């Protein structure tokens, strides 16, 4: 049917295409060299939705399926685990290149305790890494957090406490407690006096981009577009920083996608300076300064969309068109793909496609950041039709 | 979530377990032998939804996927084509049992015109058979018919007229014009003076049940239950007739499923005599098919009258499977049997409902997906847009 979901598109006026030596090819390859050594490492699939592409009037839609990222059902461990290994190497005078997980898991002596607030994936990545490397993790989750997500963290040997407070007030609590007990704060965002850990996290994320470029070359295609869903913009910064170093910022039409009740990057893109302001994974508060730098320099467009666009994405991915492969994608995982679908069925299709510079030739890269990390919610969306379109 | 979709279950107080020699193993075997001679014949898959069965607390859920039937995206040609071939053999003084479909294709004689009313699949099956056999077909469809289904028929070289009338009235226009022109009416229901053709159709339908039994035997399983969606009940009658011949009506817990805005079998089942009862394509009912009603009244365990949205839920559950289960493209009417199981699972009265239906950890449940996405617009509105949502 024809339906109107809110798709607010803003041109990035602050664009200057200045690329980042910091978040480029070479660091991504270092991070990937670390991941390749982890048991069970395998590049996550890059699925070609040729039949959806035909329907939507583009050449190709390519979906990087981070549900297959080890056993975590999301991409996050790429950054979290890298950062944690770097912290350990720095403190204990070890070499990242020759790090032994078996040695670290069993070794006696001093242990770090990693403290983190999460709404789901980030904290699970931190917990997994601490468990693998024989360290401790204490994970804080805000009020309303899914029990399955809590249990996933508990099942990794981490402590997990669900507060009576929201995400932002929970982060402050993590910080206070960490300072009090001498814990090592591991958040996936940066603030004044806290950039080292989130830098490694963003460098680690670029592994998926390095994998994806390899897969697109294997496919003999060049991306014209990329949609990147953004909470604080850590993933988008790390991933766009990489892609733009490979293809140049001028030749990649990049679109940053956020839900409209936490669109901190969008609101910063209109203003041209950081603005403080939700589906798990895309919470914000304030843009990550390190990601923000990349996006304002190199992002083509920002999108502020109503939350049901994510739900549309989930369903389209979960029951594909024609003969296309099926992808299990969580709410924040699917929202990039959701935008393409929302556009397709919108009364204003033609002029939205023109604004996104989407045409018969476009080769669109999409990232599915997580699978069904909350199965109750996933099935309510795909089976019950929760967050319906009409 | 926990949600309550209308699922009214009525025990068949009229059950007597009288089977039907007319709709049994031997006629089904004969029909299947016929179908096996048609280009493109392949038994349709019987999919094991193991992970969904574990979630729902039964042993097995097996879905006969009739979207794979000869490129037609529904089961109906099994009936319609069999009847059309029977009628042609009768006219040309031929023995249908001892010839090939290709011999029939190139048969020589006076041309026949087959006239039919349909809301989708039945008329498509008729048009398909007419095209194959070099005969003519004239299909009528009622006001509201999806343009795609009209076009499916037109693409088979048949005429297709969308009327202003509803299903029941449009059928009368078909009879009228056929009398007027010397056309042969081919409808998938019976009335007084008209039972030869719907009998063939119901026997032809039994091929899907014959295949499923063979498939279940290869899997080493025995069904405890069957859910059968029913418009007029030609499919349910034909299929339950075969199954109950194979399994005994006492050892098969059969559940007939209807939408509540046309639950003609259900209403007949509580009342005892035949009751004349917008509707999802395929499950329309004016009055029950007397040929089918006889079988169901005798042999059906229970009748269900359910909310429209039960079918929508089924479509989504089949199209985006649980765990590692295979995926199935199932239309609104195709999916309603499976929808019932899903509605039961999430219902607050899940326990008593399961008890009523005798579903437990030993249950082996045969479901028929009678069609795929015969209306792609509607299909995608349901599975993607969440049209006809639970909430």
UniProtKB/Swiss-Prot annotation, chain A:
Q: Residue positions of the PTM N6-(pyridoxal phosphate)lysine?
A: 76
Query: Any idea which residues are catalytic in this one?
Result: 76, 119
S-S bonds: 264-284
The UniProt record lists the keyword Ribosomal protein: no
Tell me which EC number(s) this protein carries: 4.3.1.15
A Pfam family this chain is assigned to = PALP
Q: How is the cofactor bound?
A: Binds 1 pyridoxal phosphate per subunit.
The kind of enzyme this is, by top-level EC class, is lyase
GO terms for MF: diaminopropionate ammonia-lyase activity; protein homodimerization activity; pyridoxal phosphate binding
Tell me the cofactors it needs: pyridoxal 5'-phosphate
Q: Which reaction does it catalyse?
A: (S)-2,3-diaminopropanoate + H2O + H(+) = pyruvate + 2 NH4(+); (R)-2,3-diaminopropanoate + H2O + H(+) = pyruvate + 2 NH4(+)
Q: Which InterPro entries match?
A: DiNH2opropionate_NH3_lyase, DiNH2propionate_NH3-lyase_sub, TrpB-like_PALP, TrpB-like_PALP_sf
| The keyword Lyase is assigned to this record | yes
Q: Which residues cross the membrane?
A: none
Q: Domain of life of the organism in this record?
A: Bacteria
Q: What does this protein do?
A: Catalyzes the alpha,beta-elimination reaction of both L- and D-alpha,beta-diaminopropionate (DAP) to form pyruvate and ammonia. In vitro the D-isomer of serine is degraded to pyruvate, though very poorly; other amino acids (L-serine, D- and L-threonine, D- and L-beta-Cl-alanine) are not substrates. In vivo allows poor growth on L-DAP or a DL-DAP mixture but not on D-DAP alone, this may be due to a poor promoter. DL-DAP is toxic in the absence of this enzyme, it may inhibit enzymes involved in the synthesis of pyruvate and aspartate, as well as amino acids derived from them.
Q: Which PANTHER family match?
A: DIAMINOPROPIONATE AMMONIA-LYASE (PTHR42937:SF1), PTHR42937
Q: How does it assemble?
A: Homodimer.
Family to which this protein belongs? Belongs to the diaminopropionate ammonia-lyase family.
Note the NCBIfam families from the entry.
2_3_DAP_am_ly, diampropi_NH3ly, PRK08206.1
- What is the protein name given in its UniProt record? Diaminopropionate ammonia-lyase
> Which organism's genome codes for this protein?
Escherichia coli (strain K12)
**Lineage summary:** Bacteria, Pseudomonadati, Pseudomonadota, Gammaproteobacteria, Enterobacterales
């Amino acid at each position: 049917s024809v339906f109107s979901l809110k798709i607010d598109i803003a041109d990035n006026k602050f664009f200057n295409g200045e690329t980042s030596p910091l978040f480029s090819q070479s660091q991504a390859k270092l991070a990937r060299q670390f991941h390749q050594k982890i048991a069970g490492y395998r590049p996550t699939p890059l699925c070609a939705l040729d039949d959806l592409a035909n329907l939507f009037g583009v050449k190709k839609i390519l979906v990087k399926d981070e549900s297959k990222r080890f056993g975590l059902n999301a991409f996050k461990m790429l950054g979290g685990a890298y950062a944690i290994a770097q912290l350990l190497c720095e403190k204990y005078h070890l070499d990242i290149e020759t790090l032994s997980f078996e040695h670290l898991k069993n070794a006696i002596g001093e242990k770090m305790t990693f403290a983190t607030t999460t709404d789901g994936n980030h904290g699970r990545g931190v917990a997994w890494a601490a468990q693998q490397l024989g360290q401790n993790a204490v994970i804080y989750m805000p009020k309303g957090s899914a029990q399955e997500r809590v249990d996933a963290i508990l099942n990794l040997g981490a402590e997990c406490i669900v507060t009576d407070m929201n995400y932002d007030d929970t982060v402050r609590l993590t910080m206070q407690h960490a300072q009090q007990h001498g814990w090592e704060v591991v958040q996936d965002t940066a603030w004044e006096g806290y950039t080292k850990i989130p830098t490694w996290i963003m460098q680690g994320y670029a592994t998926l981009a390095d994998e994806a470029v390899e897969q697109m070359r294997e496919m003999g295609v060049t991306p014209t577009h990329v949609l990147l869903q953004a909470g604080v913009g850590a993933m988008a910064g790390g991933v766009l920083g990489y892609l733009v170093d490979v293809y140049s910022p001028q030749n990649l039409h990049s679109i940053i996608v956020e839900p409209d009740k936490a669109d901190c990057i969008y609101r910063s893109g209109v203003k041209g300076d950081i603005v403080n302001v939700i589906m798990a994974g895309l919470a914000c508060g304030e843009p990550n300064p390190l990601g923000w730098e990349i996006l304002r320099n190199c992002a083509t467009q920002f999108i502020s969309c109503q939350d049901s666009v994510a739900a549309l994405g989930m369903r389209v991915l979960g029951n594909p068109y024609g003969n296309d492969p099926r992808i299990i994608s969580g709410e924040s995982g699917a929202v990039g793909l959701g935008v393409l679908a929302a556009v397709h069925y919108h009364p204003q299709r033609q002029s939205l496609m023109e604004k996104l510079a989407l045409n018969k030739d476009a080769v669109v890269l999409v990232i599915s950041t997580e699978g069904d990390t909350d199965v109750k919610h996933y099935r309510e969306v795909v089976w019950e039709g929760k967050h319906a379109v009409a």
